[PDB]
Amino acid sequence: VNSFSGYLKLTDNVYIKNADIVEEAKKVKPTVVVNAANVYLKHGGGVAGALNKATNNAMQVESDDYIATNGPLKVGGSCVLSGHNLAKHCLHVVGPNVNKGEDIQLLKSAYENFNQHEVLLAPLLSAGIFGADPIHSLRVCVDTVRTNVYLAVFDKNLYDKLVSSFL
Ligand SMILES: Cn1ncc(C(=O)O)c1-c1ccccc1
Numbered sequence: 567v568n569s570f571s572g573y574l575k576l577t578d579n580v581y582i583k584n585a586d587i588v589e590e591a592k593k594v595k596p597t598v599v600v601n602a603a604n605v606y607l608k609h610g611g612g613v614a615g616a617l618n619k620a621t622n623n624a625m626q627v628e629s630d631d632y633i634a635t636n637g638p639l640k641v642g643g644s645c646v647l648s649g650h651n652l653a654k655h656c657l658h659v660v661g662p663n664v665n666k667g668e669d670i671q672l673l674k675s676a677y678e679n680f681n682q683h684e685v686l687l688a689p690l691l692s693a694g695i696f697g698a699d700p701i702h703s704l705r706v707c708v709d710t711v712r713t714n715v716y717l718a719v720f721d722k723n724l725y726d727k728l729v730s731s732f733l
Pocket residue numbers: 689690693694695700718719720721722724
């Protein structure tokens with residue numbers, strides 16, 4: 567049993583809810599929250615900008631030190647950093663950004679990072695301002711992630727379309 571509440575069960579291991587991932591993280595304090603990161607860990611907008619704002623910019627300060635030491639992530643890659651006030655850990659995962667022309671086949675590689683964690687609170691990778699089709703992102707998630715993933719979807723309209731169209 568875990569603390570997640572109000573989710574619709576899609577599969578053995580994938581759950582979904584219409585929720586603000588920031589408000590959900592603050593309530594649950596999950597072991598892992600996933601950030602929709604870019605390779606520079608520049609948390610300007612979308613999910614990343616909202617998570618970083620909720621940490622009072624401490625996520626960005628920590629991320630700038632990570633990049634200064636290690637250099638940029640790979641598209642499809644990830645790193646584990648602090649969850650600050652939101653979670654124990656933040657898994658920063660880089661899905662491909664269609665608005666930069668990145669290979670959508672890298673979305674499966676991105677979701678494979680989730681398999682290193684038994685339970686996660688996450689957004690749909692490459693959705694929103696990363697430009698991919700969220701229906702596609704949910705299908706790759708279900709077909710790639712084997713650990714228990716609790717997906718938070720920001721737009722109610724999109725949430726209802728994801729559920730209604732789910733095979
Ligand atoms: C495009 N996309 N992908 C995921 C989501 C979301 O609401 O989580 C969205 C979205 C859709 C409409 C407005 C805002 C976000």
